[PDB]
Amino acid sequence: QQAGTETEEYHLPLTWERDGSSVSASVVIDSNWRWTHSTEDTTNCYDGNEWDSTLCPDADTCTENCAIDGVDQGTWGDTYGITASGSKLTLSFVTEGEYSTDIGSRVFLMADDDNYEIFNLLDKEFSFDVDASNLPCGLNGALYFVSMDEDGGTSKYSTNTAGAKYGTGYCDAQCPHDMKFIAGKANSDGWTPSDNDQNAGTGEMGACCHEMDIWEANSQAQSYTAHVCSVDGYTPCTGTDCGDNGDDRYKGVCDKDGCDYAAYRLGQHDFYGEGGTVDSGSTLTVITQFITGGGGLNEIRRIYQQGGQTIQNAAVNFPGDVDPYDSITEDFCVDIKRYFGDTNDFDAKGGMSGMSNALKKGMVLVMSLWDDHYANMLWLDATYPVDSTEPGALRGPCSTDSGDPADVEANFPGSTVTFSNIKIGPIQSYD
Numbered sequence: 096q097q098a099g100t101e102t103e104e105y106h107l108p109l110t111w112e113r114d115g116s117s118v119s120a121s122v123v124i125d126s127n128w129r130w131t132h133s134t135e136d137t138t139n140c141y142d143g144n145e146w147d148s149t150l151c152p153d154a155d156t157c158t159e160n161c162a163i164d165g166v167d168q169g170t171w172g173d174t175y176g177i178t179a180s181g182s183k184l185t186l187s188f189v190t191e192g193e194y195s196t197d198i199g200s201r202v203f204l205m206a207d208d209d210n211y212e213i214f215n216l217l218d219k220e221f222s223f224d225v226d227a228s229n230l231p232c233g234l235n236g237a238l239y240f241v242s243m244d245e246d247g248g249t250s251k252y253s254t255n256t257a258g259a260k261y262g263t264g265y266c267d268a269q270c271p272h273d274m275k276f277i278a279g280k281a282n283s284d285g286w287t288p289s290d291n292d293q294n295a296g297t298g299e300m301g302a303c304c305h306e307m308d309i310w311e312a313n314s315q316a317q318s319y320t321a322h323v324c325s326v327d328g329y330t331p332c333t334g335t336d337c338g339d340n341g342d343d344r345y346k347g348v349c350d351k352d353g354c355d356y357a358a359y360r361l362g363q364h365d366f367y368g369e370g371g372t373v374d375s376g377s378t379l380t381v382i383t384q385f386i387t388g389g390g391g392l393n394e395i396r397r398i399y400q401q402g403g404q405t406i407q408n409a410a411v412n413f414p415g416d417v418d419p420y421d422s423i424t425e426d427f428c429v430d431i432k433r434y435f436g437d438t439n440d441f442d443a444k445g446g447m448s449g450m451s452n453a454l455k456k457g458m459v460l461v462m463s464l465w466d467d468h469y470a471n472m473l474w475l476d477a478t479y480p481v482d483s484t485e486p487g488a489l490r491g492p493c494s495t496d497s498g499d500p501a502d503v504e505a506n507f508p509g510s511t512v513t514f515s516n517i518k519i520g521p522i523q524s525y526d
């Protein structure tokens with residue numbers, strides 16, 4: 096995409112801490128949340144959930160004729176419901192703006208006006224504070240890393256002149272087809288609008304890359320998940336390479352399931368939640384350690400702090416069926432997937448050393464607040480598949496009727512998440 100000129104681009108200031116020192120950074124809105132309009136005037140190229148067929152009769156013409164516009168100081172709060180102060184960022188769920196209505200948001204941490212901050216998580220400890228108390232069943236306040244290009248794609252794709260400055264270049268391990276711009280081009284070929292989401296559709300291309308999910312959570316359940324891909328960095332995909340939900344799920348270049356460590360699903364029901372050991376009613380510190388052996392990742396450990404207590408990760412709790420692991424390791428992913436009858440796509444795609452090499456090449460930080468039009472977040476907080484009764488089906492305390500976006504959007508429009516005190520530094524020792 097090229098940049099439009101109707102609205103100046105303002106990145107929202109955010110402080111964080113990098114190896115013992117304060118960094119005055121900022122965040123940027125993902126280009127999918129932006130207005131896409133003619134470079135000539137004000138006409139929408141993307142209008143509702145379909146592209147304009149005059150302006151966009153094929154992707155190349157669409158790319159030439161359309162632009163993504165800026166988000167100025169005022170728009171962050173009143174279109175997106177996003178505020179920041181100091182080292183705290185708050186994302187909103189349903190914000191009814193001027194003439195339109197925004198649902199959730201996704202932002203990236205910037206290094207400067209034109210580049211994302213690049214995190215090299217190997218042999219480091221990454222921490223932050225989150226308040227997930229205002230997120231009911233069916234919502235997900237997520238903090239995670241993805242192998243985006245530092246410049247959002249401008250060096251490699253010459254029709255992307257907007258770049259990281261306009262939040263371009265998102266990819267993740269889902270190989271999402273709902274991205275309006277992929278590899279610098281409008282993804283308008285073969286566009287199908289969503290039946291379910293009036294803002295969304297899917298194009299022929301998907302945008303794949305490695306993804307390290309530090310925190311996927313609402314007030315009811317939480318998980319952290321490593322997703323490795325067999326391709327290197329940001330990778331546009333079509334066809335079977337995308338591994339689309341359904342029959343192709345395991346045939347693409349990325350692991351959609353990931354190797355997930357989700358305490359509730361692993362037989363620890365009161366570890367996290369309302370009045371749990373870690374109490375979602377209140378802010379908590381989430382600390383993640385990327386431990387290496389011979390310079391390669393071999394474990395991802397998790398520690399929590401809340402109210403001055405240090406709380407070790409809860410161990411797998413299937414006595415005599417699975418060892419009490421308490422972290423992501425190769426043996427955990429192998430044994431748990433066997434026990435849960437899950438295809439080990441994580442290993443098929445490179446496993447722990449594939450992930451390590453991904454981490455070594457550097458990742459972009461993402462924070463997001465969303466609901467789930469595909470599976471109602473049931474895989475995080477309920478039972479999934481809904482009628483399944485076998486080990487690993489049970490995920491959280493929520494109803495299998497929870498999480499329909501139409502319901503949660505109407506009933507909990509005020510939902511919010513607050514992330515604060517982002518920090519990276521050497522691996523510390525814990526009591």
Ligand SMILES: OC[C@H]1O[C@@H](O[C@H]2[C@H](O)[C@@H](O)[C@H](O)O[C@@H]2CO)[C@H](O)[C@@H](O)[C@@H]1O
Pocket residue numbers: 269340351352353355437469470474475
């Ligand atoms: O809970 C692990 C789980 O992944 C499920 O797919 C989730 C995925 O992990 C999440 O990242 C994505 O956005 O939503 C999907 C739903 O497709 C998968 O369906 C489960 O069977 C698997 O155990």
Ligand SMILES: [Mg+2]
Pocket residue numbers: 334335
């Ligand atoms: Mg094929």
